[PDB]
Amino acid sequence: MRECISIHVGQAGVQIGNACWELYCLEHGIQPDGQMPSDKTIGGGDDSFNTFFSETGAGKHVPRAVFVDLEPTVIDEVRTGTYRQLFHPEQLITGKEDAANNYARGHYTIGKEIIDLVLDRIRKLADQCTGLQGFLVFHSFGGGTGSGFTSLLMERLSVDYGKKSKLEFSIYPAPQVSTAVVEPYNSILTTHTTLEHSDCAFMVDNEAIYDICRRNLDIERPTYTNLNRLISQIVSSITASLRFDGALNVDLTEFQTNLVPYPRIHFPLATYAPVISAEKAYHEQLSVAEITNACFEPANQMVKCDPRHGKYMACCLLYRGDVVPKDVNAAIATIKTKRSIQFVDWCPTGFKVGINYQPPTVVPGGDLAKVQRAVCMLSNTTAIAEAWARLDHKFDLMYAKRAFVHWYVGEGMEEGEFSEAREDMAALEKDYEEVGVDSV
Amino acid sequence: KREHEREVIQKAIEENNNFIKMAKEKLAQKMESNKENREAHLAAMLERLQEKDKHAEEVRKNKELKEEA
Amino acid sequence: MREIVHIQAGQCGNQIGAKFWEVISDEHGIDPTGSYHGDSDLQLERINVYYNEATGNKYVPRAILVDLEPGTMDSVRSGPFGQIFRPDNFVFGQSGAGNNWAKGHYTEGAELVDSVLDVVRKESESCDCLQGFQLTHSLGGGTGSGMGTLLISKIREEYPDRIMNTFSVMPSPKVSDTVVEPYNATLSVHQLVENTDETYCIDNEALYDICFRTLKLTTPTYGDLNHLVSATMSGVTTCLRFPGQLNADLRKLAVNMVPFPRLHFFMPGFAPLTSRGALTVPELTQQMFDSKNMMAACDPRHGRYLTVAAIFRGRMSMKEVDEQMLNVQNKNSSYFVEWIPNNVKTAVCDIPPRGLKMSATFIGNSTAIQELFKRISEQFTAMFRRKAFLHWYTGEGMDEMEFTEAESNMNDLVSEYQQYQDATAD
Ligand SMILES: Nc1nc2c(ncn2[C@@H]2O[C@H](COP(=O)(O)OP(=O)(O)OP(=O)(O)O)[C@@H](O)[C@H]2O)c(=O)[nH]1
Ligand SMILES: Nc1nc2c(ncn2[C@@H]2O[C@H](COP(=O)(O)OP(=O)(O)O)[C@@H](O)[C@H]2O)c(=O)[nH]1
Ligand SMILES: [Ca+2]
Ligand SMILES: [Mg+2]
Ligand SMILES: [Mg+2]
């Protein structure tokens, strides 16, 4: 019951999916061939990890996941990688020609040729669910497939599944690892198109993750592998409530109730701690208070913005490991009297806390140290609008000259779609200003 | 109160169906409009290339006329 | 796979085309017999972009050789890699073009264009997923310029949704003395603006200057010039031929490099350029942005950069490369357009070129390329105002109107580059 289906779109979505599902298997003791010796119920069950894994008669635990890309090379690495036996071949869907960093090709020209097949495969997973709860869509903002095809899929999912929950993990572009000049275009187009079809979206700023790996892990030039290992830890913390059971465990939907005050205000800010190397973590145990305090250090956020210059509409703490409420309450009380935590006047100031007792896991050969306790903070702050503002400014500079627009018009799009998408972003920025204004 | 309870759940059904209907119609309009626009751009490109072929035939025909004299 | 179909037309196109295949075959470990004797799996991971695989593990280049005379192509077949090309892919005439664009474009090339299209169609049918075409030719001759532009339009007619890439060799008085080369170049440029997605401007004026001023060659031969071309062509196709994230295919390159459809003429650059008789990343980065290292005779500091693609090859610190690329952009911010943010993209390939520990290849879309077109236009108008040698063109069926239209379109291209050079964010 309460099954969740994960959809990984484009290179960024697929490769992040590799890190997440490898981490999930390590957390649940699932072998690369899908066997889970600790699972005594063969062929099925209603355990907490069954929300993300289905079970075959042969004892294989199969991810409730679909990998989609318009180009085969990235998913071909999954088909021949370490976890190739984990997925049925029909879960890995590939085309022959990608979207070439063009939203129009991903949404219309190339995406329309594979969209029906993807929905059919998604339907096959849904038919195996007795209590399907929603979808988790992993994609980049800047890629043609991650932007164009994701928005097309989200529109189709709303039609075929009504108002069933759809959550995003969205990769916000950064110049350090970006691959296209038109990424601000694809970002604005996909945000506008997906906005009414998404219930909750966790943005991951590649620059924030890039800086954390350099600063906290002493990685000179972080790779996608470095970034994805860190991203999967945040994703694991967010989904740990769905995959594990505990007395102090709080369901993600319960957090989602506090995080979304209006349908369009559904972009939580994520902060994760501790991110520390093995050398620095040796003989240095970080307490509940220390990791909680690091959640309010802006250098640890997954999106670059300054919450101290904005207002809070929700604050959630998702602990995992050796954590008890007594230490949480004392740590929160210390933070309340030492941090710039200003709430809007129409929202309660209490912090919502969840604890999963299962300790954090690390992929062998990685850079993250294995710690006894970790925390991910999910906050709804007006400061996340700064991420929209930076993206919208880049959009305006190019669109004032209509630079690169012919690549989109040539694939069938119109200039009206650009202005309509930009106006929606301008309204979205205005919405974040309005919710921060004090009541009269 | 029972009548109000029926009206609330019917209202939720109607709004959910209307959202599905609007999403389906908006997408179909976009996909059809995009298909026409892309085909129009390709048709214009091919027409210009055909006009180049017509010009080339005119040029070659013009050479035969002067070669006779 | 994502296949590219290679076409070389005319004497210049076949010459530089042959050297290009020799260089990349060595990089991919392909011998003249088409067999693989390399030692790195990275050589064969994307080998199908430029090579077909035949019986006996033979790698046959996906190349089509075109000329209106058998002379150049016969010597290519007698070259070091002449036996690696498919014999049926040789399509040559007998009459020739006589350095007349009309004969290549209208009279003689048109008689041979259909036979070339049959070979193009055969190679495209056996493609799993065709990217497009790359053409090597010169603009100053008759066959590469005339029939080369004719082939582009005819291929564009049957493959309108594929990328058309060209390596165009710009004529210069310092290399060849055929006085109607400005005519042939202007007529060809009139076609390249409309029917190509991306064109590399290989300027013989810059090639001669590099060989003379920098390489200290008093009498530069065509082999000396072509050595620069082969090194440049290997660098600009590195992202296509090896695993990588940036500009891995022709269309993604075009999307990152072409902000406006007509402004698709690139300024290539290569580093190091040292003559017969240890290099650092900052020196390599600074050198590739210098005007003396450009393969087009244009000073980038006389214009502004719309988009730039940078490729580093060899074993080096990627942290250092990122720092130096940021450093050169900050120190030269005035020369990059502000209304295209993050317009410089950098790629690093582990495998260096032959004989070099480290190298840098520069691909730039700069408004200073108008200097190249101004030089051609100035030479064009010096003769067209006197109507010199026009009967050689009008005798094939052309008229003075087509010359005027070609001149105006190229003058419009210069104006458009100046427009976006003067454009401001505010
Ligand atoms: N964090 C992270 N970001 C990635 C990864 N791969 C790509 N990106 C980012 O995604 C953006 C480009 O989108 P991609 O996912 O690579 O492209 P795509 O979705 O496959 O779409 P097309 O290739 O154009 O058809 C850039 O901003 C990259 O920095 C990854 O593995 N991890
Ligand atoms: N760089 C270089 N340029 C060449 C070569 N051969 C010819 N050219 C140039 O091309 C122009 C003449 O074009 P050509 O190839 O002879 O005409 P075509 O054979 O009819 O296509 C002149 O401006 C030459 O400078 C070569 O091998 N290398
Ligand atoms: Ca079970
Ligand atoms: Mg991709
Ligand atoms: Mg010649």
Short mmCIF file of C-alpha atoms in Angstrom, two decimals, chain C residues 2-8 49-50 62-64 116-117 119-125 127 129-136 148 151-167 195-200 237 240 250-251 253:
data_model
loop_
_atom_site.label_atom_id
_atom_site.label_comp_id
_atom_site.label_asym_id
_atom_site.label_seq_id
_atom_site.Cartn_x
_atom_site.Cartn_y
_atom_site.Cartn_z
CA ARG C 2 24.77 9.45 -34.38
CA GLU C 3 26.47 9.31 -37.78
CA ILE C 4 27.99 12.19 -39.74
CA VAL C 5 28.33 12.01 -43.53
CA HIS C 6 31.51 13.67 -44.81
CA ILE C 7 31.73 15.30 -48.24
CA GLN C 8 34.77 16.88 -49.91
CA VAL C 49 30.25 8.95 -35.97
CA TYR C 50 32.77 9.09 -38.83
CA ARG C 62 31.86 7.70 -44.24
CA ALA C 63 33.35 10.09 -46.78
CA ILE C 64 32.30 11.08 -50.30
CA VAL C 116 26.79 12.54 -56.02
CA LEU C 117 23.31 12.53 -54.47
CA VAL C 119 26.16 8.18 -53.02
CA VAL C 120 24.87 10.55 -50.32
CA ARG C 121 21.53 8.72 -50.27
CA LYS C 122 23.25 5.33 -49.99
CA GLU C 123 25.35 6.44 -47.00
CA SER C 124 22.39 8.09 -45.26
CA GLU C 125 20.13 5.03 -45.57
CA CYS C 127 22.74 5.45 -40.78
CA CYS C 129 20.47 8.12 -36.71
CA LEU C 130 22.02 10.67 -39.07
CA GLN C 131 23.22 13.91 -37.48
CA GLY C 132 23.92 15.74 -40.72
CA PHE C 133 26.74 16.52 -43.11
CA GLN C 134 30.12 18.24 -43.00
CA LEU C 135 31.60 19.67 -46.20
CA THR C 136 35.23 20.57 -46.87
CA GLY C 148 29.80 22.61 -53.18
CA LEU C 151 25.30 20.10 -53.26
CA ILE C 152 24.31 21.82 -50.00
CA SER C 153 21.00 23.06 -51.43
CA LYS C 154 20.17 19.73 -53.08
CA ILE C 155 21.01 17.81 -49.90
CA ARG C 156 19.06 20.36 -47.85
CA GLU C 157 16.07 19.56 -50.06
CA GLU C 158 16.07 15.86 -49.15
CA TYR C 159 17.32 16.27 -45.55
CA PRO C 160 15.82 19.59 -44.39
CA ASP C 161 15.88 18.61 -40.69
CA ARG C 162 19.57 17.65 -40.55
CA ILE C 163 22.51 19.86 -39.63
CA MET C 164 24.59 21.25 -42.52
CA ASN C 165 28.18 21.97 -41.46
CA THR C 166 30.93 23.30 -43.74
CA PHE C 167 34.68 23.87 -43.53
CA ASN C 195 21.62 26.91 -46.47
CA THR C 196 24.18 26.09 -43.75
CA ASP C 197 23.74 25.79 -39.99
CA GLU C 198 27.39 26.32 -39.03
CA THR C 199 30.45 27.24 -41.09
CA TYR C 200 34.09 27.22 -40.01
CA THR C 237 35.56 17.71 -34.05
CA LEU C 240 32.02 14.81 -31.74
CA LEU C 250 26.32 18.92 -34.44
CA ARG C 251 22.89 20.20 -33.37
CA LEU C 253 26.91 22.69 -31.02
#
